[PDB]
Amino acid sequence: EEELYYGLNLLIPCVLISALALLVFLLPADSGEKISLGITVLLSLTVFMLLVAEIMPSTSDSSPSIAQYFASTMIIVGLSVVVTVIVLQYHHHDPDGGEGGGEGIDRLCLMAFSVFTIICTIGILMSAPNFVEE
Numbered sequence: 001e002e003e004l005y006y007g008l009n010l011l012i013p014c015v016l017i018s019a020l021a022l023l024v025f026l027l028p029a030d031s032g033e034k035i036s037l038g039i040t041v042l043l044s045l046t047v048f049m050l051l052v053a054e055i056m057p058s059t060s061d062s063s064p065s066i067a068q069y070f071a072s073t074m075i076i077v078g079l080s081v082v083v084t085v086i087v088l089q090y091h092h093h094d095p096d097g098g099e100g101g102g103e104g105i106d107r108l109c110l111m112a113f114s115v116f117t118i119i120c121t122i123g124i125l126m127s128a129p130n131f132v133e134e
Contacts, residue, residue: 015117029094042078053070
């Protein structure tokens with residue numbers, strides 16, 4: 001049961017950050033939150049990763065399950081923040097007023113990461129739903 005409970009508590013923050021990010025992606029205010037959340041999610045990943053990596057070590061039994069998934073994630077997550085920045089440079093038009101003012105690319109990058117998380121959690125869940133040894 002700990003497998004489900006643990007992952008759950010880990011999904012809270014995972015999806016949380018992604019959500020808060022969308023709020024900025026679609027609403028590029030460029031007031032400071034861009035760089036603020038940038039390092040936030042970056043530092044939040046490295047930390048959370050250490051925990052997931054601690055439970056799944058590799059010294060006597062080399063067989064990473066969730067780790068292999070958590071790693072590939074940081075990869076797409078890293079280059080992602082890079083593109084967002086460059087985009088902000090090119091487009092120097094971020095007026096203030098109300099709401100509504102995003103871009104297609106930003107939306108696509110979000111929709112992709114969205115399903116990526118859903119298929120991820122289920123990936124390891126279906127790969128080994130049992131609580132047996134390995």
